[PDB]
């Protein structure tokens, strides 16, 4: 479904960025984590999480990629 393009976008990020997004969206174990929990696991600020999320979403929604109906 969306998995293919989403995993494709995750592949373009660093391991740490991709971990941050997987925890934020609950992709790996089905449990989205809070900003506090993510900042504790990967040692990143809330503004840095915001930027990672924003960048990932721009990549996912860019017209270069087919979108999910």
């Amino acid at each position: 479904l969306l998995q293919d393009q989403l995993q494709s976008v995750l592949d373009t990020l660093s391991e740490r960025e991709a971990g941050v997004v997987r925890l934020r969206f609950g992709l790996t174990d089905g449990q989205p984590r809070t900003l506090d929990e993510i900042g504790q696991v990967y040692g990143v600020t809330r503004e840095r999480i915001r930027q990672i999320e924003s960048k990932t979403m721009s990549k996912l929604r860019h017209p270069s990629r087919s979108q999910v109906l």
Binding site: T12, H62, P63, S64
Partner: protein, 72 residues
């Protein structure tokens, strides 16, 4: 829909997300804009990126810094 006519669907998506090291990726930004310059939906793409607030990447023939400069 305009996304149907995006010529960047035939490109490496990462072309449109340049990262620089100690400065702007001037060449990669130009390379992305070159695709936008042969795209029939540059204006719709730029309008959508601006209206939905896409911060990262090249959209509608504009770099991320250029769209940021337009915005408040």
């Amino acid at each position: 829909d305009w996304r149907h006519k995006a010529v960047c669907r035939d490109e490496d998506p990462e072309l449109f997300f340049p990262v620089g090291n100690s400065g702007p990726a001037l060449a990669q930004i130009a390379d992305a804009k070159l695709v936008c310059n042969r795209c029939p939906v540059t204006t719709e793409c730029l309008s959508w990126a601006l209206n939905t607030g896409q911060d990262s990447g090249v959209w509608g023939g504009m770099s991320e810094d250029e769209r940021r400069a337009l915005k408040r």
